[PDB]
Amino acid sequence: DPEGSILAEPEELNQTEQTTYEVEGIGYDFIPTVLDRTVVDKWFKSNDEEAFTFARMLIAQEGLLCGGSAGSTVAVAVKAAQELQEGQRCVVILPDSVRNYMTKFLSDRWMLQKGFLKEEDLTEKKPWWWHLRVQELGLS
Amino acid sequence: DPEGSILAEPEELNQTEQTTYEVEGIGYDFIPTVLDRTVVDKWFKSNDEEAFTFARMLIAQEGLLCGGSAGSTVAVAVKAAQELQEGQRCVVILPDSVRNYMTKFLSDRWMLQKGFLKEEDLTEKKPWWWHLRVQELGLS
């Protein structure tokens, strides 16, 4: 359940100042009738930053063209499955595709504007010549 | 005695193929009537390249504004004087000043033009930034 929603229980997890989040399709300000919270063993809260980071990581490392909700699910799973051991199995549901987010997190400009990416993080992975200026080239 | 000239004795010293040299004021293709070679203990041959190098060294290090002929004398002095020990004294005659050679060896272009200097040899003493290009500067 993303931060800013009230679905997650116990209620102590929902104590946050903001109720606006960029992730789409999950989280609500009310408990839907169809939702049976009694069968959910445990709940985890997630934030937009980790969701989009994990979605990008999924796209780049596994080839799964998924959206933000999938990123949130995988981010929660990497924490929850720590209690598991070898020979056990985990399953995560990836709801939607990246077609609905082409100009959203899939775009670096949007993430930088929203603050989910930092110049330090973006440039740390870049090669040595990334910061050299154009004038250093041989050009005429 | 400069190379090409025949003032030096024994005659075996004067066995060289070129009869012309850049240095001025010393050396002739004949023995002057006033020259009494008998009072000279030893003779040395000299060339332009070493003479001008010492002349520049004299100016750059000893502060002596003397011509190439003075450089020739010192160029041989460092070789002949090696037989002397501490407490002994050596005297070198410096004929004339640098005034008569401004466009000559005093000019780096003239030395490079005559081949007495090499680009790699000359530039090896220059700072590390010597071979960088203008485009690398910050300019607007």
Side-chain angles (χ1 to χ4, degrees), chain A residues 133-139, chain B residues 133-139:
Chain A
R133 321 193 340 240
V134 161
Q135 43 84 20
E136 196 150 357
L137 297 177
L139 77 179
Chain B
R133 295 184 303 289
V134 163
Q135 47 98 291
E136 193 160 335
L137 296 176
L139 78 179

Side-chain angles (χ1 to χ4, degrees), chain B residues 65-82:
Chain B
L65 304 174
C66 58
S69 61
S72 307
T73 308
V74 181
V76 163
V78 296
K79 311 175 189 177
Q82 294 293 345

Side-chain angles (χ1 to χ4, degrees), chain B residues 109-125:
Chain B
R109 192 223 74 239
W110 188 90
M111 288 287 282
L112 289 157
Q113 169 180 352
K114 295 289 183 174
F116 302 142
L117 285 172
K118 323 298 185 191
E119 297 282 17
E120 181 66 9
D121 302 357
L122 177 62
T123 56
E124 183 271 337
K125 288 92 190 188

Side-chain angles (χ1 to χ4, degrees), chain B residues 2-125:
Chain B
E3 286 177 23
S5 178
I6 67 168
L7 300 183
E9 55 169 41
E11 203 64 57
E12 283 71 25
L13 297 172
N14 304 322
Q15 298 299 127
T16 188
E17 302 307 314
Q18 86 291 14
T19 59
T20 53
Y21 48 98
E22 297 297 347
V23 168
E24 301 184 16
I26 57 174
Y28 292 111
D29 63 338
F30 68 94
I31 313 307
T33 306
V34 293
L35 173 48
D36 184 357
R37 302 205 300 200
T38 68
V39 287
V40 178
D41 298 318
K42 187 173 191 307
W43 294 82
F44 284 87
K45 305 302 294 193
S46 55
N47 66 58
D48 305 321
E49 193 251 38
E50 73 193 334
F52 293 146
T53 300
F54 270 74
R56 283 173 164 247
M57 188 161 51
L58 281 159
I59 293 162
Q61 309 205 346
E62 306 298 341
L64 294 167
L65 304 174
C66 58
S69 61
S72 307
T73 308
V74 181
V76 163
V78 296
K79 311 175 189 177
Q82 294 293 345
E83 68 183 39
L84 304 174
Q85 64 173 1
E86 178 59 287
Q88 300 199 274
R89 176 174 293 149
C90 181
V91 168
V92 295
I93 303 304
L94 310 194
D96 72 337
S97 73
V98 69
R99 176 198 66 218
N100 309 324
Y101 315 99
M102 313 303 283
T103 60
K104 293 204 172 186
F105 74 92
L106 200 71
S107 172
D108 288 0
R109 192 223 74 239
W110 188 90
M111 288 287 282
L112 289 157
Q113 169 180 352
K114 295 289 183 174
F116 302 142
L117 285 172
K118 323 298 185 191
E119 297 282 17
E120 181 66 9
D121 302 357
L122 177 62
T123 56
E124 183 271 337
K125 288 92 190 188

Side-chain angles (χ1 to χ4, degrees), chain A residues 94-108:
Chain A
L94 311 195
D96 70 345
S97 84
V98 77
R99 181 199 66 217
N100 297 340
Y101 313 102
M102 308 300 313
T103 63
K104 291 204 168 190
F105 77 89
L106 204 70
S107 177
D108 284 28

